[PDB]
Structure formats: structure tokens, C-alpha cells
Ligand SMILES: Nc1ncnc2c1ncn2[C@@H]1O[C@H](COP(=O)(O)OP(=O)(O)OP(=O)(O)O)[C@@H](O)[C@H]1O
């Protein structure tokens with residue numbers, strides 16, 4: 084009996100259930116269970132995530148009646164299939180995504196019941212529209228603090244995905260627990276429809292916006308573009324021999340030639356080309 | 371009856387006080403500029419249902 | 421990938437942000453800000469911020485722990501005082517004042533007219549006035565004329581008490597004067613009215629106490 | 630010529646800061 | 658036909674403590690650098706300070722500047738090409754007896 | 758003794774303090790509390806401490822009193838008018854008072 088390089092599989096429904104419950108309960112830790120399957124002794128797979136009614140404070144959060152718990156799993160068995168709890172999750176809002184002193188106290192509760200019970204940390208605050216800060220941890224004993232805890236037969240959970248962050252090892256790594264890797268499994272069926280949800284019908288592809296405002300927008304943009312050219316004559320001619328990093332310090336301020344001049348040309352280009360070219364097709368195609 | 375007083379004090383201990391400040395202006399729907407009474411200014415947010 | 425790289429920087433804001441004010445810039449991508457925590461720092465700035473937003477002494481956002489320039493606020497944010505808001509016109513019509521036809525006409529052209537006929541001053545060589553002073557016996561309509569001109573105007577109007585910036589701190593007084601005048605420069609053609617400057621504009625000297 | 634005076638006070642401001650990596654529970 | 662130098666220097670410079678000990682220094686460098694020059698003054702010191710009235714009770718930063726005015730004029734001119742001119746009302750307040 | 762809920766009494770001598778502001782700051786809070794409850798009564802016995810007339814640039818301590826005095830001359834007439842706010846004033850000598858008051 085030994086650990087390995089473990090891997091946390093997910094479901095795509097889970098991560099959206101993670102953050103939306105986290106964002107809607109932002110100024111405190113919000114709690115939930117995590118529901119999946121132990122596919123082997125090496126990797127772990129969650130497929131479902133649900134919450135429970137709770138009761139919180141500013142510093143602590145508690146659950147309420149467990150009659151909600153077994154009745155929830157009962158009605159998830161008869162619709163779909165039966166499944167297995169694998170762990171749980173909560174949030175650390177704006178924190179360093181690290182297991183707290185009460186967060187660790189519910190883990191000897193969970194690791195004694197099932198072995199590979201995963202604690203999962205989410206933060207909907209340090210997560211931007213580019214990327215999510217998801218996190219998952221796995222408790223280790225203190226009795227084996229001298230003896231080795233992982234046999235380390237590969238490189239996949241050692242130097243990959245980061246070295247551990249300084250604000251998370253200040254409480255954790257590698258004392259009292261160990262981190263674990265997370266990837267994203269994708270079925271083909273949802274993968275195909277997760278691709279195409281930002282497109283429209285042919286109505287949007289064949290509009291002709293309106294020629295009054297389109298000429299008005301062209302009348303607008305060229306008019307200040309004249310004034311940008313007024314300022315552009317002065318600065319390019321000016322060029323005090325100043326070793327141009329000093330040119331590059333006297334330009335932070337109000338100074339902006341050559342920057343709007345590339346910008347408005349791009350706007351006047353892509354507007355006029357598409358407005359012409361879509362009006363081209365509505366005569367060739369139609370009648 | 372004396373045990374009921376002790377259980378109220380068990381509940382009373384884990385309460386944490388809150389900072390008092392004044393709202394300067396509303397930046398966006400979830401960004402707000404407030405100011406603590408002792409000094410400096412911050413950028414904050416509400417919860418959901420305020 | 422560079423546009424994916426710009427978006428992934430943006431976790432640094434996340435709104436526990438503190439507010440300073442921009443002061444100066446040394447060189448490329450390194451500057452000086454003055455915090456509202458009292459002290460003064462030497463910080464680093466993000467490559468994301470467009471450099472056109474700088475030097476009004478702009479209100480800026482700063483990180484808590486590491487204290488770097490992260491965001492540029494709207495410039496009217498750190499003001500701590502407001503103008504005549506939306507509806508507090510004191511309900512005094514222009515014809516409510518009786519028989520001040522010299523002085524009602526004089527102040528009205530002292531304020532509204534150089535918005536239009538500015539170059540008639542320079543062609544004569546007048547150098548048009550920035551400010552106007554009013555005085556007299558106590559109750560000859562000094563406040564009412566300034567009270568009436570707010571009702572029948574459209575410009576930004578900021579009422580100012582005589583002696584409110586006299587707080588017991590170190591230098592809040594000159595900080596509040598900067599807060600007023602940046603707000604007048606930022607908003608509009610504006611009108612600043614400071615009633616009772618006798619509380620401050622005294623003659624005597626600096627008694628060192 | 631022989632005239633006394635009173636006085637006044639201009640109290641300084643105060644500010645504090647920390648590393649803020651300390652948790653405040655320890656209870657439970 | 659001399660280089661006129663007008664110094665207003667009324668009270669906005671009287672408050673400036675840290676550079677108050679140099680504003681006369683490089684100014685008299687400017688007079689001996691440019692030309693045969695003539696420096697003009699006005700009531701500004703007499704409104705600032707006269708004598709030891711604001712003396713041991715805090716030094717008020719302004720009479721200390723006046724002691725540096727007297728320091729350089731004691732140092733060496735013999736006019737050399739440069740006069741200074743001062744014009745005032747409220748004539749009977751300052752310390753002219755030491756300056757006679 | 759009729760109202761017993763909506764009556765403000767001021768000794769007009771405990772207003773002063775040791776700081777520079779902080780005496781006006783009471784007066785702003787008073788009228789704003791008098792702004793919130795609508796039918797308020799203000800009573801300041803013995804104005805002659807805070808009242809005075811004028812001094813020709815004397816002590817800086819006099820300038821603290823006069824700046825405190827001019828906050829009353831503002832916020833009785835000023836910009837913001839008053840409604841249902843009545844001010845009873847009492848003194849022994851009225852000759853020493855400011856004619857602007
Ligand atoms: N020409 C006028 N027409 C109508 N009412 C007037 C006129 N002149 C003065 N008043 C009266 O004077 C008041 C206008 O404000 P006031 O003249 O008191 O301001 P002020 O001159 O600054 O006084 P103070 O110097 O005492 O603050 C109003 O209450 C009004 O009743």
C-alpha cells in the first residue's frame with residue numbers, strides 16, 4: 084500500500100457549480116459536497132457537485148439538517164444511476180487557497196471513513212475571465228513525518244504545473260498534507276457544443292447596419308482624425324535630441340501621436356470594408 | 371437555567387466586529403469606493419442582496 | 421498568446437484594492453505614488469495601463485501587500501465633497517431680488533459672459549478676471565444673489581463653507597483645497613463659491629504656537 | 630505690551646500595517 | 658544700462674524652511690554672473706521680520722534669512738559693480754540702525 | 758417640559774476644545790441632528806462665551822472662537838434654509854454681541 088502520482092479528473096458541470104455557488108456566497112466560506120467515483124488506485128474522477136442548506140458567520144460556516152443529505156442522494160439514484168461521494172469543497176475568498184485549521188479538522192473525519200477523500204479549494208475572486216484558480220489537497224499523517232509518503236516513480240506530480248506558491252506553503256506544503264494535480268476530461272458530445280455558442284443565425288451575417296449612422300460615424304471619426312494629424316505634424320517635426328528614453332519619459336502624460344493614428348485607421352477600414360462587402364452580396368445573391 | 375446562560379455565551383464568543391465606513395461613490399455595479407473613518411480609502415463590493 | 425497574456429495579468433486587481441494618488445514617474449515603467457495611508461512609496465506599474473491617463477495627480481489603485489500601480493481610477497473619484505447635486509436649488513428666482521439692477525447685471529456678466537466673448541478681452545488688453553469679491557454691511561443681499569444665481573444657471577456649482585478645512589490633523593487643510601480645485605478642473609465650466617473667507621484670509625502673521 | 634495668550638493642539642495622524650498572513654480562529 | 662533684477666519674494670518664499678538658507682546664495686551668484694546688475698527689493702522683509710521680537714521663542718525662520726542677508730553684505734561687495742535698491746512704506750519698524 | 762423628546766439644550770461654553778477644528782464639528786452635527794428630526798428646538802443659554810463681537814487681529818485663540826462663531830452665521834442663513842427649526846437665545850448683556858448675529 085502506497086501513494087502514486089495521482090490525478091483528479093473532473094466533470095465540466097462541476098466547475099461551473101463550484102464558482103457560481105462560490106461567487107453568490109462571496110464574503111464567507113460556502114460549503115458543498117463532491118460526488119464522483121474511485122476509478123482506480125491511481126486517479127480519481129468527480130462527475131457531480133451539489134450543495135446543501137447552510138448557516139454561516141463571518142469567520143465560520145456550518146451545515147444544517149442531515150435529513151437533506153440522504154434524501155438528496157436517494158433521488159439522484161433513481162433518476163440517472165447511483166454513485167459515490169468522493170470528497171467535498173469550499174471557498175477561501177481572496178485568500179491564499181490553503182487549508183485552514185478548521186478545514187483540516189473535518190479531514191480526519193473524512194479520511195477515516197473513506198481513504199482518498201479529497202479536499203478541494205476554489206476561489207472566485209483571484210479567478211479572471213482568462214483562467215480559474217482551482218485547487219485540491221490531500222491530507223498526510225504526522226506519524227510518518229520522517230518516513231517517505233510518496234514513492235515518486237515519475238515526474239508528473241513533482242515539477243509540473245508549478246512549484247508551490249509562497250502564500251500557500253506558508254501554512255501547508257509540504258507540512259500536514261500534499262497537493263495533487265488536476266486536469267480536464269471532455270466527452271466529445273459536450274466538446275462539440277462548448278465550441279459553438281457565440282455564433283448567430285444568418286440574420287446577423289447579412290445586416291447592413293444603417294447608412295445614416297454609418298456615414299455619421301465616418302463623419303465623426305475623420306473629424307478628430309484631422310485634429311490628430313494637427314498634433315502629429317508638431318511632434319514628429321519637433322524631435323529634441325534628447326536620447327529617446329527621455330523622449331519616452333516626457334510622453335507619459337497627455338502625449339499621443341502615432342497611437343490613435345494607427346487606431347482610427349483600423350476602425351475606418353474594417354467598418355467600411357464589411358459595410359461595402361455585405362452590400363455587394365445582397366445584390367449578387369438576391370434576384 | 372444557568373446552563374442556558376452558558377450556551378448563549380458559547381454562541382457569543384465567535385462573533386467578530388465589523389469596520390464602520392462611509393460610501394464615497396459607486397464605481398460599477400459591484401465596485402464601490404468607501405472610506406474608513408480613521409483614514410484611508412478602499413475599493414470594495416457588496417454581497418448580493420443589499 | 422499575447423492577448424491571452426494580457427487577460428491573465430488581470431487577476432491582480434480582484435477588489436481588495438487600496439487607493440493612492442499618482443505623483444511622478446522616474447523612467448520607463450516605474451513611478452512614485454502618494455498613498456492615502458500617509459506615507460510615500462516607490463512602486464512598479466503594469467504594462468497594461470495606457471499612459472495617457474497620467475498627471476492630473478490622478479487617483480490610482482494600489483495593491484495591499486506589495487503596493488504597486490494596478491489601476492487608474494476615474495479622476496473625480498477621490499474628491500470627498502460633491503457639487504450642487506441634482507435638486508437642491510434653493511428656490512430663489514432671478515426676479516425675486518428687488519432693486520439690485522446694477523449689481524445683478526454686473527455679476528451676471530462677470531460669470532457667464534467670458535465663456536462666449538473671451539477674445540474681446542485680449543483685443544482690448546483687459547486680461548479678464550479670474551475671481552470676484554463681494555462685501556458690504558451684514559444683510560444687504562450678499563448671500564441671496566449667490567443663492568439666486570445657482571437656480572438660473574446650468575454650470576457646475578460647488579458651495580464651500582468658510583472654515584471646514586481646519587481639522588486637527590497635520591495637513592488635511594491643503595489636501596482639501598487640492599480636492600476642490602481638481603474637481604473644478606475635471607468637471608465642466610464650473611463656479612466655486614466660498615462664503616466667509618474672513619475666517620481664513622487674515623492679515624496678521626504666523627504666530628509660532 | 631503686557632498681554633498673555635492661550636494655546637492649541639495639532640494632533641498628528643496615525644497608520645498601521647501588517648503582513649496579514651495570520652488567521653484569527655484557534656477556537657474549536 | 659545694467660541688468661535689472663526684480664525680486665518680489667514676498668511670503669511664499671518666507672515659509673520655505675529647507676531652501677530658505679540658499680535663496681540669497683545663488684541669487685547673489687546670479688548677480689555676479691550675468692552682468693553689472695541692479696537688484697530691486699520692497700517691503701517684504703519688514704512684513705516678515707524686524708528684529709528679535711520673534712526671537713528666542715521659535716526663531717520664525719524669517720529673521721534667520723535676514724541674518725544671512727546681513728551675512729553676505731558684511732562679507733564683501735565694495736559694490737564691485739552692483740548696487741541693491743529697496744523701497745518701502747512703514748519705514749519705522751525694521752532694524753535700520755545696525756544697517757546704517 | 759411640554760415636548761421632553763425634541764429639545765436640544767447647549768450651555769454654549771463646553772463647545773470649545775483643545776484641537777483646531779472639532780468645535781465647528783459639534784455645530785454641524787447639531788443642526789444635522791436638528792435636520793433629521795423635523796420639528797426641533799435649539800436652546801443656547803449665555804452666548805457671551807461663544808458670541809463676542811470682533812477683535813482687530815489679536816490672539817490666535819480669538820481666531821478659533823471667531824471661526825466657530827461664523828459657522829453659526831453660516832448655518833442660520835447660508836445656503837441651506839431651515840424648516841421647523843427654532844432657536845431660543847438667552848444672555849445677560851446684549852451689547853457685547855456681534856451685529857452680524
Ligand atoms: N434686495 C432684497 N430683496 C429681498 N430681500 C432681501 C434683499 N436684500 C436683503 N434681503 C433679505 O436679506 C436676506 C439675504 O441674505 P443676507 O442679505 O442676510 O446675506 P448677507 O448679506 O451675507 O448677510 P450676512 O452678512 O449677515 O451673512 C434675506 O433673508 C432677505 O430677506
Ligand SMILES: [Mg+2]
Nearest residue numbers: 562563834835
Ligand atoms: Mg449672509
